[PDB]
Amino acid sequence: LAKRIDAALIMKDGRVVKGSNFENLRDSGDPVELGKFYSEIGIDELSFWDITASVEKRKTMLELVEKVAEQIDIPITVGGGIHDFETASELILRGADKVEFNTAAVENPSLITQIAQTFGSQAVVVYIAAKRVDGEFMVFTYSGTKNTGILLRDWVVEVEKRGAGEIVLGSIDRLGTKSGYDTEMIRFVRPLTTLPIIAHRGAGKMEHFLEAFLAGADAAKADSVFHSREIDVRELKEYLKKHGVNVRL
Ligand SMILES: N#Cc1cc([N+](=O)[O-])ccc1O
């Protein structure tokens, strides 16, 4: 019942990279400054997804989490090429509240459980990227590029069994669109898990958020719509209250 509004930030070499081509002379790509803006306009949680080159990535991500954790006080999730237990554990110890796995969880589902048993299920988020292929929802890894042959309906159940705290449900069919979350995919996954479901991909207007929530999402994640100011968050959370949704205000 209690719904959340989450912001996603793409990170490269320690700086925020915008997901569209809007600009502003003052808007620096400093994650701490952007994190403070989000914290201060009432975003519930932040996720960072790091696309940095192989070689500097692991210390770049540790540096990032240390700076943002000192300075902001909403939960932070970190992800993007977290391959193993040691990497994830180092990030949680340097300050991240949660780590997000996709490819490595698919390839080694025990990883979910190892993190959950050490730091608590709350610390493990599994991002499931899914697409319709020949009439069925399949799971994709390597940033939407490898069809794993695993059914979405099988992987959701297994993720919960392994001890994940939450699922982000990213519709590859909604990637590059701004006409709404994949409410059909949301409805399909909802009876298969008791976990919080975070909807991702497709957000364009305030109504979209309403509709995801009514399809059974517990949170909705977006990037551009908030960074560009195209949706004012206080206004989003007042609209949602008015339409029957329990949000923090
Ligand atoms: N969280 C997250 C996230 C994940 C992916 N991804 O698993 O490709 C891309 C962008 C994101 O903001």
Residue numbers in the entry: 2 to 250
Article passage:
Catalytically essential residues from the initial design include a base (Glu101) that facilitates C−H bond cleavage, an H-bond donor (Lys222) to stabilize the phenoxide intermediate, and a π-stacking residue (Trp50), which was designed to stabilize the transition state and favor substrate binding through interactions with the aromatic ring of the substrate. This initial KE07 design (Round 1; R1) catalyzes the cleavage of 5-nitrobenzisoxazole, with 103-fold rate acceleration over the noncatalyzed reaction and a turnover rate (kcat) of 0.018 s−1.
The mutations in R7 and R7-2 (Phe77Ile, Phe229Ser, Ile102Phe) result in further optimization of activation energy. Finally, crystals of R7-2 with the hexahistidine tag crystallized in configuration B with the hexahistidine tag in the active site (even when soaked with substrate). However, when we removed the hexahistidine tag, we captured a high-resolution structure in configuration C with product bound (configuration A was present in low occupancy). However, in later generations (R7 and R7-2) evidence for turnover was only observed with configuration C. By R7 and R7-2, configuration C (which was the only state we saw associated with product in the crystal structures) becomes the dominant substate sampled, with configurations A and B sampled only rarely. In the most evolved versions of the three configurations we obtained from our structural studies (R7, A; R7-2, B; R7-2, C), configurations B and C displayed lower energy barriers than A (16.8 and 16.4 vs. 19.0 kcal mol−1, respectively), which is consistent with the gradual conformational selection of state C along the trajectory.
